[PDB]
Amino acid sequence: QPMIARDGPHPVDQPVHNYMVKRIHKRSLSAAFAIASEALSLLSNTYVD
């Protein structure tokens, strides 16, 4: 931060430095996907049908 030079019945000011630390926040996403029993019976054949 900057600083102003003044006079009179005021204390002399000094330059000030600030330090900040922020942290991450974790979230997620989810989506389902279904398949039926007839489709599973039709898909698992392995070169027979």
Next chain:
Amino acid sequence: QPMIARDGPHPVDQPVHNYMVKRIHKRSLSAAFAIASEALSLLSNTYVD
């Protein structure tokens, strides 16, 4: 229909498919047309007049 993926205390979602069936409806159009008897006698002389 589309899907939105979300988190938190929400159950996970799966997309939907909709099947609809419509059937036809039968209408008509009718218009009348009259011919006088003397006109029918004139048009059907059969090679006399």
